[PDB]
Design a binder for this molecule. Structure first.
Ligand SMILES: *[C@@H]1O[C@H](CO)[C@@H](O[C@@H]2O[C@H](CO)[C@@H](O)[C@H](O)[C@H]2NC(C)=O)[C@H](O)[C@H]1NC(C)=O
Ligand SMILES: *[C@@H]1O[C@H](CO)[C@@H](O)[C@H](O)[C@H]1NC(C)=O
Ligand SMILES: *[C@@H]1O[C@H](CO)[C@@H](O)[C@H](O)[C@H]1NC(C)=O
Lengths: 107, 137
């Protein structure tokens, strides 16, 4: 039920943005949102969690922003490695993760 | 009484919510006589008295450090010294919720003396001077 932008593109060194919205029942404003850089075959790497700060070791290039209707993941200073699939997740402290449809970033 | 070291090995927050138990159980008053044999062998009492003196001395050393840091009456006190990233690079959540005070003490054990000198010199010795220069008029 959590819908992202199917695809998004950004030039080299630019700042791209991935949307992440869903239904009223599963609202971004109600819960917290985490983002994942997930190459499909490889093990996924946590990049954003709790809608604030970042995962440990993540460069300051990744940034997040949660509106009351949709979430946005911003990746400044785009790199060739950033051409992977990104997934958002809605959750509480006791309810499991709800992944989105996914977004493929082109550079 | 009870609950001593109840939060050992837990998150640093759970430990920093119950410092009063450790504080009251640091200094154990003499267990009074249940009931004749108050006079005892000299050799036997020598160990117990030395242990009590060492305990009292360690407590007064900690209280002396408190006094020269300006935190005599409180168990928790914030200071003016900024954290230098040299000693630790991990953030707040990586410390207070993920780690315990044990591994944390070992990580900062090398720098604990360096922080102590800073806590004693950088802030309080300037604070008292600025207080005298401020209330001088
Ligand atoms: C240490 O003890 C704590 C509990 O005192 C354990 O972590 C908690 O486990 C319960 C039970 O699943 C959860 O409801 C809490 O949310 C947990 N707390 C945290 C901060 O995660 C923990 O598993 C124990 N082990 C270690 C190594 O810390
Ligand atoms: C932090 O540590 C470095 C290296 O020891 C030192 O050069 C610097 O002055 C320190 N900064 C502070 C504020 O103590
Ligand atoms: C502390 O110093 C010793 C050397 O005396 C060193 O081997 C150790 O890695 C140091 N640990 C930290 C956390 O600085």
């Amino acid at each position: 039920v959590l819908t992202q932008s199917a695809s998004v593109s950004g030039s080299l060194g630019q700042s791209v943005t991935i949307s992440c919205t869903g239904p009223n029942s599963v609202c971004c404003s109600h819960k917290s949102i985490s983002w994942y850089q997930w190459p499909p075959g490889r093990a996924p790497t946590l990049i954003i969690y709790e809608d604030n700060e970042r995962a440990p070791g993540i460069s300051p290039r990744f940034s997040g922003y949660k509106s009351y209707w949709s979430a946005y993941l911003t990746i400044s200073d785009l790199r060739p490695e950033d051409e992977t699939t990104y997934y958002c997740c809605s959750y509480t402290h006791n309810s499991g993760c709800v992944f989105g449809t996914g977004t493929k970033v082109s550079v | 009484f009870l609950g001593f070291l109840g939060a050992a090995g837990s998150t640093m927050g759970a430990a920093s919510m119950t410092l009063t138990v450790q504080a009251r159980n640091l200094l154990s008053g003499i267990v009074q006589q249940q009931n004749q044999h108050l006079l005892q062998l000299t050799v036997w009492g020598i160990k117990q008295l030395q242990a009590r003196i060492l305990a009292v001395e360690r407590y007064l050393k900690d209280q002396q450090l408190l006094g020269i840091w300006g935190c005599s009456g409180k168990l928790i006190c914030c200071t003016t010294v900024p954290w230098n990233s040299s000693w630790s690079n991990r953030s707040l959540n990586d410390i207070w919720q993920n780690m315990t005070w044990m591994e944390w003490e070992r990580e900062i054990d090398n720098y604990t003396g360096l922080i102590y000198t800073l806590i004693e010199e950088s802030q309080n010795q300037q604070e008292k001077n600025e207080q005298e220069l401020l209330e001088l008029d």
